[PDB]
Design a protein around this ligand. Structure first.
Ligand SMILES: Nc1ncnc2c1ncn2[C@@H]1O[C@H](COP(=O)(O)OP(=O)(O)OP(=O)(O)O)[C@@H](O)[C@H]1O
Ligand SMILES: Nc1ncnc2c1ncn2[C@@H]1O[C@H](COP(=O)(O)OP(=O)(O)OP(=O)(O)O)[C@@H](O)[C@H]1O
Ligand SMILES: [Mg+2]
Ligand SMILES: [Mg+2]
Lengths: 694, 55, 288, 205
């Protein structure tokens, strides 16, 4: 594993020139100035030899072929340009990841900033790259240094055809390939000179090498919610570090790492392994090793189905009609999982069967304020066939294997083994006190908790069969899908936490497409309005989500909470799939229509009336709701009398103010589309909720 | 055998006829603005037991 | 193998693990443990156990009869950008197929579980205990849905099965759950030719089975099966308490194997327990 | 000796009852306590557990064995699921309530609360099945060889448990009405088995 170290860093660093190039812009080539800047730090030769001569030593031809398998002056283009929409640029503001700042929502007014602010990027690179030991111990701490800084800078960025993918992911997905090229060429048994297969000939694409593995932590939903209530947060976070330890021990039994990975969010996780005579039976062995671990603990409530797809390098490009077979790359591993999800638990795992952690995980619930998670051995909370999992304090260095630090990337990014799991910030209060904290300082608002359960609609559809509208030799690259899968994973696992700034709620599992938030009812809806409105800016709204909110009292069980809002977003997955559903199986408004026509159009004007008058009140509101629920044709006329009778009763310094209310109220009551009526039936509910005294 | 159950029969023959309020719905446009509580199958006035208990 | 046993259920409760979930059907354990409890309330217990151990005895799981007999989804037979993904969320709540459509299903036709019941839950309590606030789930059939345990017809079996209809079937009996009425009907021939017990080519089991130890290896590498969980307590009249059973895993109905096998009746007696608590896992099959 | 005798009484509500329902989301101008109704038949029912627990406690106030063998007991080795299988009632006169003009079979009663010392009311809309609804009641007493001359001791208890429930409420907010109930047309056929009918049908009234 000595040559695998030096082949890996130089694959990540073969385009470290273009961040040293475009900051303090020279004129010469970028592949040379990368190693020129690199030789001043630690003076390592073999890594620098991979940087000197990879664009024109039997080590840099692996980088030259894998730079092509990544994708085969101008700011970074947006990943949501190549879809069913053809008028946007939305170039990225090239700043760094911050974790305590607002997301750089990419607008079309960021084309010129291609030279200036890159010096703020390259300054931070000197901090962590200098004191760097280049072993496999700090093997992921450099992967922090690209995702936190090199993210929003572009790659080649010339007048080429790719123009879209990043430099962080292009460093990862090339270095993901280059180790898998090594294991495919080593397990084949020939090392007699790379140029002969890679540069002398180009027929390396025409064989099924570097297969795509995957797994699926099934039973992940029914484990958590079938349980004075914040113990569920640690239960949903325990299955993330289990979901990462599966993804890390599978790469410990191989010679790979977090570069050789495309997704880990919530049970599902994709990979790029090496299609060898070795990796196919270390998957069967690790699947057999881990599923018997789940039997002795969780007794087939959980199951992991390792499926793999043996694809070829030709089926990843854009030149041929490989996008018509690009879904088949994921499908071959998805057909194996869906077949392994059926035929589970082979013979002697069942013949042996036909003949604690329940208390131990309570100790992990008090370890949630800690931020450093350790892979210990036979101590507490087992997560693997000989390992355990504990949340230790700052008093670390007690027999660690992985130091699973918190979501920082910046604060704890100075220690050893920076392994990162991005989960669930802003657990503000305990769950039984979100109802009682709905009254303001004035003391009005209704004492009810409310719980958001949302997901993004066609995320698996747009991941696989996305980028597929522009020609027959269309774009549809794995790199265009890895950066898509990075963009959603960087949205949910990071940016939700700043959307929950001080919104009086507790995010539980901002994971894959799912978000399960639970908090006070006023700011659980203010969260959801500031969730998708930030998301449609983030996605150039063409790929939508759907929420379901359920208003409950205090001390209702969470299994009743999470199901009755779980089967209340199912009513929002059937409206048009782009819809909120509030508190019940009706009120299923389209989400874009919910904000511009209920939450800000009507509810402000209902708030603007009763907070700028004196003589009306809740009695007038309640008889408007009762005439809005029934709606006969008789109640159109009966409401025309009721609103005109109250002009006569006002004090004539408010009559024209009320006349602008009733000419606007009776406008949306009498229609044919039946649309604005139930909107104002809902807009009166949220107004009369927020004004109720004890 | 110290479990019994007895009943006070009475006859509520009233004066100043009573209004135990019922459906406070949005009434008709010139009709009774506040009706009384009634038996459904006969539409006769009732005096409910809950209005006799809290009072 | 003989006649259908249509049962008009009307508000039953068939729990699966918990009390908060009824499951709209019942395994062959639920009907076999019922008959043994009927045969113990009568005197005719050992007359049934000799017939239960008999080679010709057949049962199957319950499947929704409303107009014609329905069958479980053959697990592992699907043998284009969003609908192939959209229908996977819809052909996963698809489990009960019409007998006039199984041959159409294996060649491709969409179905949606034409609705049989509203599987709701009700909230109940005990008023003077301060901690009894429970919920019983409920399957409530759509006024013509029946279930038909397919069984070998006998004078003893009709004597006991017509005693279940006035004694309930399933969970929360003595509270108004599981009480039904029988209609023994002749099996149609287009279903009757595919019923097998010792076939050898591409068969589908339609009851919860558990093979003999030699045969159990044979069903693994070629079977598109699905597991279950036969936990719970043992209902007895000679214990003074309640003990757990021995928690075996059976292959759920719809387990399409490559060929048939022979399964036993698994004895799940607790440790130091007077009588024998059984579990019917004899299989019954269906060609394609 | 094996038989299964079945009661078929007619539950008549002299005062309209409430059986609570289940915790669902009530809106502003909606009923705060909807009655439990079968989802398919949008009609009221009386659940068999509601008839059981009221009859269990009322006979416990008298017969305090005799009570455990009629209702079951998880303890008391031989008295698990003892001898009675109740059934959820259903509306019998759904066609006979209309023509005595009723537009919806459940009335909605409006109530409030007068908080003491502030005198501010606190309204409430609870839904109740109307009075002359008649529910069909089926109580099933199963005969096995383990009875041994107890098939008349167990009918001065059931017919007295009905009589106690005549003069007590049946479900929901009793002591305010809502349970003045009547059992009508008592008879005990033998739907399965071989047992007489005259020795217990003449015990009535
Ligand atoms: N750690 C976690 N905490 C909470 N929810 C999670 C977690 N991981 C995954 N989930 C969510 O739970 C959802 C339900 O997954 P489920 O339990 O159905 O497994 P599954 O693999 O989706 O099974 P199937 O593929 O058969 O539907 C997933 O869509 C996922 O978004
Ligand atoms: N971080 C991720 N990267 C790539 N794909 C993801 C990611 N998270 C979730 N997905 C996709 O989203 C899916 C979540 O499934 P889920 O059932 O929650 O909704 P869905 O399949 O997207 O469609 P629908 O919302 O209509 O049910 C996963 O199957 C996965 O394919
Ligand atoms: Mg989702
Ligand atoms: Mg989705």
């Amino acid at each position: 594993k000595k040559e695998k170290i030096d082949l890996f860093y130089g694959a990540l660093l073969h385009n470290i020139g273009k961040v040293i190039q475009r900051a303090t812009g020279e004129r010469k080539k970028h592949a040379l100035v990368g190693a020129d800047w690199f030789d001043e730090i630690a003076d390592n030769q073999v890594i620098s030899d991979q940087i000197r001569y990879h664009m024109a030593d039997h080590l840099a031809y692996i980088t030259y072929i894998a730079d092509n398998i990544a994708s085969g002056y101008t700011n970074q283009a947006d990943i949501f340009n190549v879809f069913g929409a053809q008028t946007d640029k939305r170039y990225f503001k090239p700043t760094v990841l911050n974790l305590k700042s607002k997301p750089n929502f990419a607008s079309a007014t960021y084309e010129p900033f291609s030279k200036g602010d890159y010096a703020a990027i390259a300054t931070r690179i000197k901090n962590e790259l200098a004191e760097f030991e280049f072993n496999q111990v700090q093997i992921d701490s450099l992967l922090n240094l690209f995702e936190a800084t090199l993210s929003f800078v572009p790659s080649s960025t010339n007048t080429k055809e790719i123009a879209d993918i990043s430099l962080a992911d292009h460093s990862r997905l090339t270095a993901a390939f280059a180790l898998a090229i090594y294991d495919y060429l080593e397990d084949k048994g020939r090392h007699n000179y790379k140029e002969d297969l890679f540069t002398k000939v180009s027929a390396f694409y025409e064989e099924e090498a570097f297969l795509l593995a995957s797994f699926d932590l099934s039973g992940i939903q029914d484990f958590i919610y079938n349980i004075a209530a914040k113990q569920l947060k640690a239960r949903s976070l325990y299955l993330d570090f289990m979901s990462e330890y599966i993804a890390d021990s599978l790469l410990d039994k191989l010679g790979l790492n977090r570069a050789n990975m495309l997704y880990v969010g919530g049970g599902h996780a994709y990979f790029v392994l090496a299609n060898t005579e070795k990796t196919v039976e270390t998957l069967v062995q690790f699947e057999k090793d881990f599923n018997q671990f789940l039997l002795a603990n969780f007794q087939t409530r959980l199951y992991v189905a390792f499926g793999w797809g043996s694809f070829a390098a030709k089926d990843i490009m854009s030149e041929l009609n490989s996008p018509e077979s690009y879904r088949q790359v994921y499908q071959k591993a998805s057909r194996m999982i869906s077949k392994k999800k059926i035929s589970r638990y082979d013979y002697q795992t069942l013949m042996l069967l036909n003949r604690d952690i329940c208390r131990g995980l309570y100790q992990f619930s008090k370890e949630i304020a800690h931020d450093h998670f350790i892979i210990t051995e036979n101590e507490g909370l087992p997560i693997g066939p000989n390992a355990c999992l504990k949340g230790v304090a700052f008093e670390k260095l007690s027999q660690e294997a992985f130091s699973r630090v918190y979501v920082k990337n910046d604060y704890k990014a100075g220690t050893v083994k920076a392994t990162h799991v991005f989960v669930g910030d802003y657990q503000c209060d305990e769950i039984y006190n979100y109802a009682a904290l709905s009254k303001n300082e004035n003391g009005l608002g209704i004492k009810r908790l409310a719980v958001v359960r949302l997901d993004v609609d066609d995320l698996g559809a747009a991941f696989m069969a996305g980028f597929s509208q522009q020609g027959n030799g269309q774009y549809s690259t794995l790199s265009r899908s890895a950066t898509f899968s990075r963009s959603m994973s960087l949205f949910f696992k990071v940016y939700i936490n700043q959307f929950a700034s001080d919104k009086k709620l507790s995010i539980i599992y901002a994971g894959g497409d799912d978000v399960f938030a639970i908090g006070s009812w006023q700011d659980i809806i203010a969260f959801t309005v500031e969730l998708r409105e930030n998301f449609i800016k983030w996605t150039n709204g063409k790929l939508t989500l759907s929420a379901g909110i359920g208003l409950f009292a205090d001390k209702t069980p969470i299994s009743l909470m999470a199901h009755q809002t779980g089967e209340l977003e199912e009513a929002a997955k059937g409206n048009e799939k782009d819809s909120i559903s509030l508190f019940s199986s009706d009120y299923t408004f389209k989400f874009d229509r919910f904000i511009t026509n209920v939450y800000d159009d009507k509810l402000e004007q209902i708030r603007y009336f009763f907070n700028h008058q004196d003589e009306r009140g809740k009695n007038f509101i309640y008889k408007l709701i009762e005439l809005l629920r029934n709606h006969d044709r008789m109640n159109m006329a009966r409401l025309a009398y009721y609103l005109t009778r109250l002009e006569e009763l006002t004090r004539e310094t408010d009559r024209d103010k009320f006349k602008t209310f009733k000419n606007l109220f009776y406008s949306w009551y009498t229609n044919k589309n039946d649309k604005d009526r139930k909107e104002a039936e809902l807009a009166l509910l949220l107004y009369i909720y927020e004004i109720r005294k004890d | 055998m110290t479990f019994a159950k007895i009943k006070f029969s009475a006859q509520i023959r009233l004066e100043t006829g009573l209004h135990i309020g019922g459906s406070d719905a949005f009434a008709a446009i010139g009709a009774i603005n506040s009706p009384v509580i009634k038996d459904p199958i006969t539409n006769l006035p009732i005096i409910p037991g809950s209005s006799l208990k809290g009072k | 193998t003989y006649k259908l046993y249509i049962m008009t259920f009307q508000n039953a409760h068939f729990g699966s693990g918990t009390l908060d979930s009824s499951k709209l059907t019942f395994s062959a354990d639920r009907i076999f443990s019922a008959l043994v409890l009927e045969a113990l309330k009568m005197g005719k217990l050992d007359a049934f156990l000799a017939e239960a151990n008999q080679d010709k005895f057949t049962l199957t799981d319950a499947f929704p009869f409303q107009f014609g007999p329905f069958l479980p989804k053959p697990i592992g037979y699907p043998k284009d950008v969003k609908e192939v993904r959209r229908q996977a969320k819809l052909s996963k709540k698809l489990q009960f197929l019409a007998l006039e459509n199984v041959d159409d299903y294996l060649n491709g036709e969409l179905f949606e579980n034409e609705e049989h019941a509203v599987i709701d839950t009700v909230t109940k309590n005990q008023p003077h205990k301060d901690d009894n606030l429970y919920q019983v789930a409920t399957t409530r059939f759509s006024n013509d849905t029946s279930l038909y345990v397919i069984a070998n017809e006998s004078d003893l079996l009709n004597e006991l099965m017509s005693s279940l209809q006035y004694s309930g079937l399933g969970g929360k009996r003595s509270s108004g759950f599981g009480r039904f009425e029988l209609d023994i009907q002749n099996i149609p021939l287009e279903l009757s030719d595919r019923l097998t017990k010792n076939h050898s080519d591409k068969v589908m089991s339609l009851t919860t089975a558990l093979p003999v130890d030699a045969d159990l290896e044979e069903a693994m590498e070629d079977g598109h099966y699905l597991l279950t969980k036969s936990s719970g307590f043992a209902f007895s009249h000679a214990t003074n308490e309640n003990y757990r059973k021995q928690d075996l895993y059976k292959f759920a109905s719809g387990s399409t194997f490559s060929k048939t096998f022979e399964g036993q009746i698994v004895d799940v007696r607790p440790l130091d327990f007077p009588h024998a608590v059984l579990n019917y896992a004899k299989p019954l099959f269906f060609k394609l | 000796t094996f038989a299964k005798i079945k009661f078929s009484a007619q539950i008549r509500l002299e005062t309209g009852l409430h059986i609570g329902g289940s915790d669902a989301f009530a809106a502003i101008g909606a009923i705060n306590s909807p009655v439990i109704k079968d989802p398919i038949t949008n009609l009221p029912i009386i659940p068999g557990s509601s008839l059981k627990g009221k009859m269990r406690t009322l006979l416990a106030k008298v017969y305090n064995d005799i009570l455990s063998r009629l209702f079951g007991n998880s303890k008391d080795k031989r008295f698990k699921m003892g001898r009675l299988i109740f059934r959820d009632a259903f509306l019998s006169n759904a066609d006979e309530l209309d023509s005595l003009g009723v537009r919806s079979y459940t009335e909605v009663k409006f109530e409030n609360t007068i908080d003491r010392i502030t005198a501010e009311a606190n309204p409430r809309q609870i839904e109740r099945a109307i009075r002359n609804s008649t529910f069909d009641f089926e109580l099933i007493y199963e005969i096995t060889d383990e009875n041994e001359n107890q098939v008349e001791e167990d009918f001065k208890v059931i017919r007295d448990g009905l009589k106690l429930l005549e003069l007590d409420y049946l479900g929901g907010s009793g002591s305010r009405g809502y349970g003045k109930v009547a059992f009508e047309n008592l008879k005990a056929t033998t739907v399965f088995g071989n047992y007489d009918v005259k020795t217990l049908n003449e015990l009535l009234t």
